[PDB]
């Protein structure tokens, strides 16, 4: 199975426009992941992450995106925030592995890396494993709007990654493997 096509891919998307890469019709090793100690979360729900080489799944879906350092804990079943509610929600019966690692040396230019966007306003909470790539002006009273106007904001904000920051604001590339 190609895990370099997911993990070693150069361009991860934003957290709001995340994407799935279906892994099918191949033998999967899974041992290129847990033999590495540089992963900062590697949290697996259901499976025990070392008993993955004797399980044959129907299909493996790999959701890949980029969050902030402190936003990694919202990638979990049942958690809430501005990433778990408006951007990327995991189901309560999630069976899979959440892998995250600190890509400060790639995604943090010292000028500022304002290319990864998250949604901070929405009308309601996302259903699990759903996506919202729509960028429409958000008005809290529900009427359509056109900025610049009062009570009218764009729903997407920029992370703004900097090299000289702590590990709670550093960029963390997140790959969420989902098994079925």
């Amino acid at each position: 199975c190609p895990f370099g096509e997911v993990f070693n891919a150069t361009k991860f998307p934003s957290v709001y426009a995340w994407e799935r890469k279906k892994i099918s019709n191949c033998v999967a090793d899974y041992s290129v992941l847990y033999n590495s100690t540089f992963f900062s979360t590697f949290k697996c729900y259901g499976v025990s992450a070392t008993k993955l080489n004797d399980l044959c799944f129907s299909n493996v879906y790999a959701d890949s995106f980029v969050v902030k350092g402190d936003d990694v804990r919202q990638i979990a079943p049942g958690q809430t925030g501005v990433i778990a509610d408006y951007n990327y929600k995991l189901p309560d019966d999630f069976m899979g592995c959440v892998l995250a690692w600190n890509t400060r040396n790639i995604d943090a230019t010292s000028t500022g890396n304002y290319n990864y966007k998250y949604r901070y306003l929405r009308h309601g909470k996302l259903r699990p494993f759903e996506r919202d790539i729509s960028n429409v002006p958000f008005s809290p009273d529900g009427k359509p709007c056109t900025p610049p106007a009062l009570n009218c904001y764009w729903p997407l904000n920029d992370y703004g990654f900097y090299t000289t920051t702590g590990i709670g604001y550093q960029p963390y590339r997140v790959v969420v493997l989902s098994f079925e």
Partner: antibody
Amino acid sequence: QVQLVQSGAEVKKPGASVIVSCKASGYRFISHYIHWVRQAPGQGLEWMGKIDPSGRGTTYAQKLQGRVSVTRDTSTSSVYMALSGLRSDDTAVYYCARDRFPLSDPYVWGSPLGGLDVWGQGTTVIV
Amino acid sequence: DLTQPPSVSVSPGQTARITCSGDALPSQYVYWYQQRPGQAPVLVMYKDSERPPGIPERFSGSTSGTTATLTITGVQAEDEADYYCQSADASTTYHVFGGGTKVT
């Protein structure tokens, strides 16, 4: 002073192995990848293979595996490329080019390799 | 596999759009090189939108889905060169080069 000084021009026979060197200078040698790209006359650029100068592995083209073999010499700051069994289609200008990506801490996996920056002068070999 | 048109014919003054399409590029960077005939290529754009020093402020890269785009605003008479695009196989192995575009 960043520069990649290659070998000189050569002529070969269809089957004689060729050695093209790529002497590096200036930059920290074990940091950046060194790529190997050829170019047939009248054709576009063709990527052959790369090398990690701190002995961490090679990668070759999918239609050149078993023919091209690259190697590194840390003491002389040089990278050699060996092509065994040339054909009539392996007449090209052979470019040794650097990588625009300072590799460092373990190997921050997810890295942007490619972006060939400090291309060499080009060794022309004719079969 | 990365494909691109073989030639773009623009008079001095217009806008030349060198497109570069590849199915393995929603997640991979495009590196653009120019090669005036005779010498080594010169890297023009890197990481789909960024331009190194020494490259003038006419080139402006883009990426809309699985399609790259280099734009020369205000083409002069020293832009007659072959333009190549680069990618990988959605891993970071097997770097590929485009077919070339002789911009005239």
